[PDB]
Write a protein that binds this ligand. Structure first.
Ligand SMILES: FC(F)(F)c1nc2ccccc2[nH]1
Ligand SMILES: FC(F)(F)c1nc2ccccc2[nH]1
Lengths: 240, 230, 235, 242
């Protein structure tokens, strides 16, 4: 199953200590990648290292703050010294008037991390950038507004970046999850969980593994002609 | 009737092309019109154009990238004419789009106070006119659409509408000197087989500003003769 | 004589499904804008009612019987209109099961559209405006009808564009009718909570958008679907 | 007595239009992933060629004659597959001027519907299914081709999403793959100077291979894609036409 092998590649997965990010990190490791998972605390990083080890995945856990040029540059250097250039990068890391700052800040962080890893990918003439959107289920109209805004911004961003870097055989894609069984979602009020479930044609929540498998495919050689795409993974619930 | 009499309209980037035609269309509908430019020369020209067409208002200097210029300009308008209740925003892909949306946000938030007091408003965002160019164009359009929809959601309960107009190939100063080969290829992609006039964008704007469009919000109306670039 | 200074003076407009709600309001708006209006219904009773409504509002035109599913009724109604009033250059289409519904409706749009295109091609001018349906099983049907209508409208606009005919659609959200006014208080409040403007739309608010799309000012708008939904977007 | 885990082994897949290009590559990819594959064509000649291609590649299955525009041919074909091999739980539907778009799209969607409804009964009883619709590749070069292409894609997206909704509660997914410019007969025979302008519209700077579509289909068919439904995955090297 050679079009699925990630053997020989180094993959950076931001926000990898739990839920979707962790499952992505294990799916890339299982496919044969060396995996570097990041968290914002030392506690998170150590826990990533442990989870990788317990699953036989070589790599590391480390601390990365995607909002800081310094942390990004420093982290990339660490990865280069110890393991080599990451050619697969997965970016995974409420009031009504706050949607603008959240989305703007997040896209600025995708941009900052994407640009820093592009140089290595340009040299290698090969790359995979995969952006993970946010999980559904924020409270109120404020939550639906923020959710729709983040998704539209992510789609346009992903498509433009794919265009900018395409000639270098780097693909850029996104995955837009729906209602997925995670820490955040299990702790939602039961009424809110039940109302969201009632809107899912498949009649169940997604597993974190079901996002990871899509990411694993996008990282593979078999997805080499897929770029600029946003793959929704939402059991048929399309929230606009 | 569908008169804009008694309303004050601010149109940014109003010294030429699409912005100037929007300014005159709102004036023709009876609005008091404040048009902006980035130089004193632009502002003066706007004032002269308005006068020559019988439109009351003013030309002024506004830099949408500066909090200070925005706050100051609005203050001048408020002292002298009242709150603008109709605002039309007409003034490396990543930096361009990010900068522009941060500007829409900045201007939009400052004019929202006046609109919230009046319980009524119209915000209309004008997208940019039609590989590097296609990428930039598609990026600016996707960002504008999501932005317009989200802001509409945030201000809707206050009877303020927020909409966008996405122009295609329009006859302006930028487009008037494009090489013949590029013009011909573009025409071949336009079902109506011609460029749009600046007036044709202005009429869409004039309708979105009206009472009849009061249930239209969050929309991006494409005005492109049937040429859709994604 | 008496000449309106409104945008549609001198034009003949056909509005299908005009005996109530959205269709009736579109018919009166086009009339108010100075068009001669032909409104259609599927029964003689509907047609007569349309005729009475138009007269009562000072609109010149007629109410007629049209079945958009029948080639014959279409061709025949068009001939009658051209003989008695002139060529209609403005046409507004307002007349588990989701597939049949959408497929049947798009086949009807195609049939009516093709028959009126000959008059519009001779005049080198036209407006075709398709009205989508008003808002689980209901959301699926609604999203399907809207996606089909959007792709259809854009493809037809491409096919006829070189003739200075525009083709556009209007996609309504929740509009105020008897069905909606009689919803229980809890259900109506939950509904309004999904609409940023916090209210239902009036039929007139759809009609004003149609009236604009029909005007000379909208000459460069084609292939578009203008949502009129108070900011509530479902797909 | 072979009990599979997380694979297509033992699943029966029906691939319409499987005698050449995209369809054939899909049929071999599903075979390689362990499915029993039934590939269809509209002629006996096509069917025979499918049978031979499957055999030569070590895939179990069959080539058959199916006309997706005919209720009779559909019902009859499904009956034959049921009697001899079992219910197909994976089904892949793969089977100029501006003014032809309506007939093409209307005919094709009616056919997706007809085939999809007939296979749903088997999938409902199994509580498991995969329906994958393949869009059309860019067909000619100017306006007429772009119109037709964009129309077929918009129809396919809305159709896929609505059907996904209708059948979701039965653990059947419905998805689509929208190819761009793929290396085929239509593309190979075209003028050389026009090929360079075409590539200039594709950020990856090349045409896609049929295998690159087949791999996306193979993933959508798998257990790992169980929460993907209603989606249209574009496979176009970054060239988006609408
Ligand atoms: F519209 C929006 F979702 F707020 C957004 N912000 C952006 C910032 C940079 C690039 C695209 C963006 N899109
Ligand atoms: F949903 C549907 F009824 F199948 C349909 N029919 C169509 C015909 C032409 C374009 C889109 C279409 N969508």
């Amino acid at each position: 199953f050679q079009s699925m092998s990630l053997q020989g590649k180094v993959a950076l997965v931001t926000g990898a200590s739990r839920g979707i990010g962790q499952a992505i990190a294990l799916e890339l490791g299982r496919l044969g990648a060396v995996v570097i998972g990041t968290a914002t605390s030392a506690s998170g990083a150590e826990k990533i290292a442990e989870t990788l080890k317990a699953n036989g995945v070589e790599g590391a856990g480390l601390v990365l703050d995607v909002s800081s040029d310094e942390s990004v540059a420093a982290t990339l250097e660490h990865i280069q010294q110890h393991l080599g250039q990451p050619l697969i990068v997965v970016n995974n890391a409420m009031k009504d008037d706050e949607w603008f700052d959240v989305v703007n800040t997040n896209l600025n962080s995708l941009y900052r991390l994407s640009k820093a890893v592009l140089r290595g990918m340009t040299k290698a003439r090969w790359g995979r950038i995969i952006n993970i959107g946010s999980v559904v289920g924020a409270m109120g109209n404020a939550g639906q507004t923020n959710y729709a805004a983040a998704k539209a911004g992510l789609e346009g961003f992903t498509r433009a970046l794919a265009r900018e870097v395409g000639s270098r055989a780097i693909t850029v894609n996104a995955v837009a999850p729906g209602f997925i069984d995670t820490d955040m979602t299990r702790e939602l009020p039961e009424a809110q969980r039940e109302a969201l479930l009632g809107q899912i044609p498949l009649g169940r929540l997604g597993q974190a593994e079901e996002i990871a498998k899509v990411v694993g495919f996008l990282a593979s050689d078999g997805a080499a002609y897929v770029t600029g795409a946003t793959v929704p993974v939402n059991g048929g619930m399309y929230m606009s």
